[PDB]
Design a protein around this nucleic acid. Structure first.
Ligand SMILES: [Ca+2]
Ligand SMILES: [Ca+2]
Lengths: 440, 445
DNA sequence: TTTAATAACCCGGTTATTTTT
DNA sequence: AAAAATAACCGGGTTATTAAA
């Protein structure tokens, strides 16, 4: 009884599309024209108050020719034993089943000859096979299809809901209450929800994501959702850059609005993880067709029980994202001396030798969407705008000046930064994580 | 020059309001009718196409009487320097400025005889003194106020912008870009902004915040706000749209408290309640803004101990000293806890956990004016006065003899496991206790 | 013979004490 | 007589080795 797919041929934006469905469907995307045409395709198939006006000239493909519109719904009916809705659809259809063991049923909408009397005319045919479809019998204004289904449309009998953007002029907690009410109540068994707000999509289970695109053909991507608050604003994006901390984010929001400031309208997003852990995020983004991009920094860690033996932490966190094996450990000797500045200067010079030692493995990290820095953000930020960093802080060592307060000295660099400097950050050879987010 | 105040007297919701407002005014609250009526009071004061129809019967306070509606605006006139609006405002007037050393200017709005042929007969007067105001002169349909000020209204010469709900049919990143165009650049200098959106208040500085109260007296709280302001305003921007705010340190007591405030009072966000994450024990960054806007700043803390850097065995008293730093008082002295080297771990944790009760029952006089104000201090942490409420049900779920040791290892991963299997009576058990009296003051019961 | 309990590191904050110049 | 590390806690996360019953 759970709906298999819909085939739309010659409608107002479509040429040949086959959108897989189930119950509880969510439609999003960039263009609103394809989302309105998807819900009006369901309204022309299953609602009589749109279907009684017929088709206009604008309801065909573009505005002229290809004068044969099919909208076909395929239900995947099968045997659900004594069921409330399935035995109802056995009971009203009756004689249009060609066999008693058929596990599929078709509802087809045909339209032809727009050019004669300026009128579309819509013919609805039942049938469990693609050949020998039987016409739906009706006496007056009422078909026998209208005894089965009922369509309720929301915009600011098996019941189908069609909801278009309920986030307009409501509070966000009312969107959270609508988000729980769409998935715990059994009266919202079948819907098609069009939305932009992330608060309607916090809790979500067993849901076909239908993504429409900005192309003129409009192709649709259809994905199953089975089982989070950070991912809800990243559900509406195709490309997600996964970054570690807020100091990365303030720099990237200053660069990405001074180079290409409409990146999130095109479908890019900046996602925080709050640490160095990406494997809980990339399995969620991989199942939903969202292209993750990972930016992380190379780190070293001292080993417990051994003095001088250091383990390769930032390399192994990219090897565990690929399912690979860990590396063997290194040995650094460090004297007593002072451990404030000089110990960090030994540990930078070891990590550069590591980063040139495993450069062909950095290459197969970068063949996937994992980008690993040489040391940190603050040291390859110094490799681009290091002539501009000494003027702002009035200091000889600006990396050590950012090392004291990582975010508070970052926002003083952000608040005094020129327009040409963001191109120098963005066009660097080591800031290539940004170039895969914008898609250029 | 800058705006100084408006005084609205007998208009359609107000009885006597003296609203002190600077430039770049931001208007918010749960009274959308009062925000709409405040912008209509500015349109009857300063716009031509609203004032040419006059007052109807509906904007005579409630529906009747109130026979003298006075709307008086003061702009105080004394900045000059490179801004020529002082020179325009003193060049258009002739005899309203009687003395050239005066530092106040009055634009007054009057109306009378409300029951004569259903017309307001709006009269506009100028003057630098409150007594003997002169009449604003005009020839035909155009006053002398009309040649000075121009009003542009947005709803989906000296320029005044009146913007009403711009988040309708506007995308979220363009709301953030509209906040950046409102407050960083100098394009809009005089505006009044009404909104319901948290993302128009991210980048804001040097602005007057007007909070409209939910009561029927429609009084307002106006705050001069000057300032990492992104890290402050990202948390604070959804908290300003809330009348009462609970300040919590961690995401364990968002997951714990949102289950309880959906089982007991699930419409608590619709009456002016909010839960504010801090991410640590730093509440002095957040209480400076909420107290000046009339928002109650409710705070739940835990007692903490720290070993000192130089001496061994003595303990800095960080549980009470973070609560006195909001109250500005002098810090406490030092205590001595004798812990040997071969005790470390669970025994060391319970040996410090006894001494956090021993410092708390000693200092019950000191915590009386903590809880008399909106600062709440726990016994040890969240998970022992949570065990003093639902502790028979803590041992049911984890299949553990001592579940508070089982919960400190995990934090969120067994806090979520606790919150998913909570019964209905359990969320009234935890809401009722006197150590969870911070939850009552958020909802007022 | 498994099993929890810290060393080590990452993403943010504070406040008093050495420390070095 | 300062100002810059450095303990030592607070809100979150992951491996890996050790002590531990
Ligand atoms: Ca890093
Ligand atoms: Ca705590």
């Amino acid at each position: 009884m759970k709906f298999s797919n819909i085939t739309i041929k010659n409608f107002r934006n479509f040429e040949k599309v086959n959108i897989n469905l189930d119950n509880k469907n969510v439609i999003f995307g960039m263009n609103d024209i394809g989302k309105t045409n998807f819900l009006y395709a369901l309204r022309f198939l299953l609602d009589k108050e749109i279907r009684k006006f017929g088709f206009n000239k604008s309801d065909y493909h573009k505005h002229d020719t290809s004068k044969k519109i099919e909208i076909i719904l395929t239900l995947d009916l099968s045997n659900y034993e004594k069921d409330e809705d399935t035995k109802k659809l056995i009971s009203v259809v009756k004689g249009a089943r060609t066999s008693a063991n058929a596990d599929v049923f078709y509802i087809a909408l045909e339209s032809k000859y727009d050019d004669k009397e300026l009128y579309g005319n819509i013919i609805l045919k039942w049938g469990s096979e693609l050949d020998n479809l039987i016409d739906i019998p009706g006496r007056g204004n009422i078909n026998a299809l209208d005894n089965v289904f009922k369509v309720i449309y929301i915009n600011p009998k098996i019941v189908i809901y069609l909801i278009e953007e309920p986030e307009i002029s409501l509070h966000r907690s009312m969107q959270i209450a609508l988000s729980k009410q769409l998935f715990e109540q059994s009266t919202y068994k079948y819907f098609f929800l069009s939305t932009h707000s992330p608060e309607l999509l916090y809790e979500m289970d067993n849901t076909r994501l239908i993504r429409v695109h900005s192309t003129e053909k409009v192709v649709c991507s259809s994905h199953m959702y089975n089982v989070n608050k950070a991912l809800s604003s990243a559900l509406f994006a195709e490309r997600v850059l996964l970054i570690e901390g807020p100091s990365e984010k303030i720099l990237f929001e200053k660069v990405l609005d001074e180079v290409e400031p409409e990146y999130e309208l095109n479908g890019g997003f900046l996602l925080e993880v709050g640490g160095t852990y990406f494997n809980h995020y990339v399995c969620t983004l991989n199942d939903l067709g969202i292209t993750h991009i990972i930016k992380t920094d190379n780190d070293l860690k001292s080993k417990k029980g051994k003095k001088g033996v250091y383990e390769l932490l930032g390399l192994n966190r990219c090897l565990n994202l690929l399912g690979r094996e860990n590396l063997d450990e290194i040995t650094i000797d460090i004297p007593e001396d002072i451990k404030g500045k000089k110990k960090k200067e030994r540990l930078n010079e070891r990590k550069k030798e590591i980063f040139k030692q495993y450069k062909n493995e950095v290459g197969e990290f970068l063949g996937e969407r994992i980008y690993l820095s040489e040391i940190d953000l603050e040291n390859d930020l110094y490799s681009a705008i290091g002539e501009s960093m000494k003027r702002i802080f009035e200091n000889e060592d600006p990396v050590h000046y950012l090392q004291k307060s990582k975010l508070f000295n970052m926002v003083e660099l952000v608040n005094n930064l020129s327009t040409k400097d963001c191109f120098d950050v963005f066009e660097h050879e080591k800031f290539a994580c940004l170039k895969e987010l914008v898609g250029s």
